[PDB]
Symmetry: D2
Subunit: 455 residues, 4 copies
């Protein structure tokens, strides 16, 4: 729509497209911060709407906001949650480090919309006001950090963790199914002593189980909300019960154990909870990177690699099955690693009463959660559930190796056993062929003595 609406702020008037619900401040920011293409994540936008919804409910309970106004604001917030106004937040991540502009973005949209809901109009003659009504008892300084934690905790609880558990179950079922399949071990990439495929996979299972605990340990710090600390953390210009009540409200509407932060100065001055929580995520990325690599190397071939297992072929050189899911997973694991560095830099750069590197920090954090969650979900259903053993190749490899020589020690002594191994190695023979050439035992004795199942 070409038609504009004249909206204004302390700096004056500015034209805002008529079909949009934002106001003067969002328009100015739009024209001043034309940097790249990254905008606030949908999850962050919703967490912000949830924050305003809770504040309005509590402001009402405290008699600070009229029931009518509070009711409309709450109704407008739910529409945002319903995903009806995704197009009303055009601001880039690269704005003021406090997230003030996005706070104002939400205030203007909620104000203009709540006004219409009350039978009013959008624009300067709106019935609900961005700062006076919607931002009542708040500050960008304590609101943005709160929305960050709400977004982060819910994402971890509802997206990441469930997917992690499902992948663990799948690998655990595989572990039990292949418990009896003996394969050759590999250390330093070299052939080594045997272990079952089930045991190898149990290592992957334990890794995921350990990661889950680590992620759980990071949750209580992210559950702490800054809301109530206002501008510098003192809680100036607020009702004494506000901080506790708004945290209770959020906990109630989300069903998550949110608590108000015991120290508001630590909550406004840093992003410590997220720096620590992301530390657990980069650990999960390192574990996943290893599991994904093991899978693609074990399935390499089909003739000139390892080929001990086969994985589902999902896309359209006969046996050339590219391990694409493994490639998407390893690539996103590198991304999480780099995201951690950007986060550490921003988290270490707070000054005095406020950390102004917030948009960037939350941008990287929510991206890593999405990547890890969707990545495991994709890897699980498009690869993990269909992992199968190439029993013939496995056995071929086992019998061609020199590692089974240890089974002969108790029967013929170390010296003769090592002699057999050396001969087979220098001459390019199998352990059996060498043993028989030397005449140290009969083929029947070899077949009875070398049982890989007793490794």
């Amino acid at each position: 729509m070409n038609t504009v609406r004249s909206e204004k702020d302390s700096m004056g008037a500015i034209d805002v497209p008529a079909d949009k619900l934002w106001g003067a401040q969002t328009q100015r920011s739009l024209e001043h911060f034309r940097i790249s293409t990254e905008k606030m994540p949908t999850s962050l936008i919703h967490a912000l709407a949830l924050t305003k919804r809770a504040a309005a409910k509590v402001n009402e309970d405290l008699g600070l906001l009229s029931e009518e106004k509070a009711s409309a604001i709450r109704q407008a917030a739910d529409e945002v949650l319903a995903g009806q106004h995704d197009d009303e937040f055009p601001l880039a991540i690269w704005q003021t480090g406090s997230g003030t502009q996005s706070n104002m973005n939400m205030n203007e949209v909620l104000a203009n919309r709540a006004s219409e809901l009350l039978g009013g109009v959008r624009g300067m003659e709106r019935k609900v006001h961005p700062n006076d009504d919607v931002n009542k008892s708040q500050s960008s300084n304590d609101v943005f950090p709160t929305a960050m934690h709400v977004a982060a905790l819910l994402a971890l609880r509802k997206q990441l963790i469930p997917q992690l558990k499902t992948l663990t179950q799948t690998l655990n079922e595989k572990s039990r199914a292949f418990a009896d399949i003996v394969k050759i071990g590999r250390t330093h990439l070299q052939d080594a002593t045997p272990l079952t495929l089930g045991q190898e996979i149990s290592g992957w299972v334990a890794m995921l189980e350990h990661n889950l605990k680590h992620i759980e340990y990071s949750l209580p710090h992210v559950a702490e909300l800054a809301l109530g600390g206002t501008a510098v953390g003192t809680g100036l210009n607020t009702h004494p019960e506000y901080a506790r009540r708004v945290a209770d409200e959020l906990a109630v509407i989300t069903c998550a154990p949110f608590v108000t932060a015991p120290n508001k100065f630590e909550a406004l001055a840093t992003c410590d909870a997220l720096v620590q929580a992301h530390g657990a995520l980069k650990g999960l990325a390192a574990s996943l990177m290893k599991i994904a690599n093991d899978v693609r190397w074990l399935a390499s071939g089909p003739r000139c690699g390892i080929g001990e297992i086969s994985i589902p072929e999902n896309e359209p050189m006969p046996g050339k099955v590219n391990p694409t899911q493994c490639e998407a997973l390893t690539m996103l694991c590198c991304q999480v690693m780099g995201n951690d560095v950007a986060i550490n830099m921003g988290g270490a750069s707070g000054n005095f009463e406020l950390n102004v590197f917030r948009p960037m920090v939350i941008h990287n954090f929510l991206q890593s959660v999405r990547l890890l969650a969707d990545g495991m979900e994709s890897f699980n259903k498009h690869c993990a559930v269909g992992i199968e053993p190439n029993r013939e190749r496995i056995n071929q490899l086992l019998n061609e190796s020199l590692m089974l020589v240890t089974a002969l020690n108790t029967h013929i002594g170390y010296d003769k056993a090592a002699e057999i191994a050396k001969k087979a190695h220098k001459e390019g023979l199998t352990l059996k062929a060498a043993a028989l050439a030397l005449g140290y035992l009969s083929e029947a004795e070899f077949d009875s003595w070398v049982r890989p199942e007793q490794m």
Copy 2:
């Protein structure tokens, strides 16, 4: 549109939305790689279209493609360049590490579109074929790396460099204008010997000039194109003049000094050119971070900070002017730092004949170029051009410091000068008040001897 079209590949048939120009392979990938929200950058998409346009022209010259087919394909590519099909590339960055799916994405769109252009229809009875005609003499392995370099070089030349030069000019004009303004120096954050504001700014100018040279030194390696090496770099299934001719064509249509890579094995097996080029970018980020911090600290206040300079106030506590542009710049500088780590990890992980971490590498690289280019452009027009000195504050600070005591040495000796400084420091007096209290010189002598302009 709910209506589908039945398209197929080696794996079978799949429904594709009727209003879309992509085919079977793009649809399968769409359903297999639902990971996060990041898709290929517009710049990469265009570079890919440019690559196909050049290959078609050369295939024509070699008599490998009919003039009609080649002409249509070229015409379809220009529409992509004109930005008419931005909605035809829905694939995520998190796909096969070679960029095969995006290569196929471009092949299908170009095929279906060129078909219509020839008076045909889209779908299975298309006149132009994705692999046979559009991917003729190519492979995903050499095409994606080529599109990466075309995108990277043009972005550096047309976006980054021009903005860098403009910012340098602005700071250079400021340097000359404030050449005569003496201010207090600061080392370790402590007061130190004087220097002019013009000199301080010249340091910023030299930093930018040095960065430009470094960035220029990285350009020749990125100008090398892998096109012609095919699957493993041997150039199997290609015309001997193809590699040279396609590089010439691209150089001609872009006006950039593109050359075919002297070693195709180094070109397909690594992302070395970009790892090195991004090293120069993280250097520019470190320099910019410093310039941005200097600016915000020098302008801090308006009463309880430094306040030596004032910057344009761009948004709506009277003197409280938040240095928002400085905050957007410092935040993106941290992002470039983290991007470098993800890139280094992917670049170090190539295996044998191919590096399969490409989508992620190019995703991070183009983001850093956009961030740095738009960041300097924004910082320049919304802050740098309007930097002004608070001459009164500067002079106040100068006269209140103890650092000017050095001017008295040649007149009264080191011992008396240090005595004056110690007294002023312990008692909280100005150098003049202390000197007069001691009676070592007259006020007229002080005023004549301590001339900060001769630092």
Copy 3:
């Protein structure tokens, strides 16, 4: 020299050294840079060998004479008697086999002498058959890594952290009544007390302590008993549990045998996670250190709200220039911890099949970070934190110089009017009171009684 030998042949080792042929060969093959195994790791390795000897002895796999001699030799290493016997670079085999052998040879040769024997080829105790009994470089090195890691965190890092927290907590309490101007975006903001500002630092350290504590259980899991690939082949079924118990007893730390030896051998996950908490601490410390040096900046042209002890000599002609050196040392080491994390992440993500072979590099960075953080907190505490004092005059001067207090006037005079004097003060360069009186909107008496900064 002396002539020692292995399967590859004989080689000359200096007569005055207790190491064998394998260590000598490595000394010639891995001449990379100057980094060697840190003392903490050397001790953790000796402790692993000491515990293995006791259990082997208990199971009847090793004779008392040999077991006791190996333990005695191990104790000498712990006593700092053999520091020059470990010349190997960190940049060796990724499994740490070289260092496992370095310990095996030194312990065997010395245990020989301890039994009235001689060092070298004619030794009574054997490095591989005796000292390395029931073990493998594969499960021994990871065990030594966890022992050194857990002990460094519990004995060095945690106590120093607690001490620094107690100091800043005292300061928070002592300056609880001093009101100062807040700063957001580096701009003048509403007031808070120096005590509240310092309590923020305190809360940061308290949170970090709990994060570090949550990482200890995974680090306490030991790989010993996993043997070559984690199956435990060639070990008594009670070996793994017994050796873990032995290690717990002699170190007084809650060590346990890893429930899954495959996870233990194939990864460095516990350390990747434990280090995540360390870089978390580095980000917090960087912030605290920066606040301190900025607050102490000056003496005349900065902020100068606090004063810190001057430790290094200065120039007679330049009194007042007190460079915040402890803050500079601390911020530099914090940048180092961040870089260390990246190196550890890359090595930790690179394991293949049954064994991660980036171990020497991972333990090198991990132990350095712990060393940096513990010594850094102690130094900053003793030479800076304990001496933080407020410059009460500047603090009040700035407070009464800012336009931020105009807020208190709003409740006594309309927003526009209160803001009116603020505009004049700002524009004319006057103070809130000067402008208020000059504008005749109030009197000195009522202004002073209205603008109460100590009431927030």
Copy 4:
């Protein structure tokens, strides 16, 4: 002990040491970790002092007797006669003032003795007035950093890089006729020769060399003459150019005076950029090292296309297990360079106003990376690269076992038919020929003449 003193008073320094009061004070204030200044940096600092003495002498600012004595003392440090005289930790003042003073005191005390004088308080040469004449820690430390950096790159890194390139170039030439199966996504792909594959490694190193060379000009710019804040206050107008010339002459490197001293003092930009090229080299080296160990994997259950020298002793009962140790050492140090870059980036982005104070940490990481890369390339070259040999039988076995060659049949038989035998071979587990003959689509003779792998 001996009693030395400064402006803060006197303090006891061990009699057998040449350092003064300032160094002793720092020794007590900065007891952080175990890292000290590296020898290369110590030498670069002595060289800076030696050059400063000559110019001061030439300008008539210093007496011949003192100047010559200071230069003689400086040369003794270069000769390795005073390594134990620099005990200071890297984690000190961010400007490197402590280390500048450590050099000033050691040089003054020694120069005193050299003039028939005594070390300590009664010295004939003065650390601050004589040795530090016309200088400041601010412009001296950055100068020493560039001198050490440029020299390490030109003398150590570049020659080793060239050597490794020459070796791999020889191998590329020697194996130019050996055809092998290509691998993309870790899957069997079309053929290429071992020589072509190795030429890729060669091209990588050649490109890296030029990138490293492009970074040298900025590193050659010196800060000396910039003095405290870069203005050059208290220096003769010819000082900066003369001292740069002097340094160029005695080191034989193209050192020049920095055109803008403010950029020189306020940043570490040259090193941030030069190190970008180093991490670039680390990514390349990591890839080459991985290809080598994967290609040599086995001996029976891996790829096993090549063989590499066995350097460490193995087990008699386990012949064939050759762990790629040089590759492991190399990959670990490459991860280290990546982490180092992060630490350097953070310090380099943190300068404030007239001076960057993260210098000791930046030079610490930079010199380590150079050390790691140079020694790593030498070790990998001598103990691995020179000994790479192809296992011709396995290479052919794999080549004739893959279905990839079916491509050559297409030109002699329709796509579908050629693919038909491939399907059978794959499904039935037969070889291309076995399936082709069993399907009766051709004869042994025509198959062999059609499938020519050596014709790509």
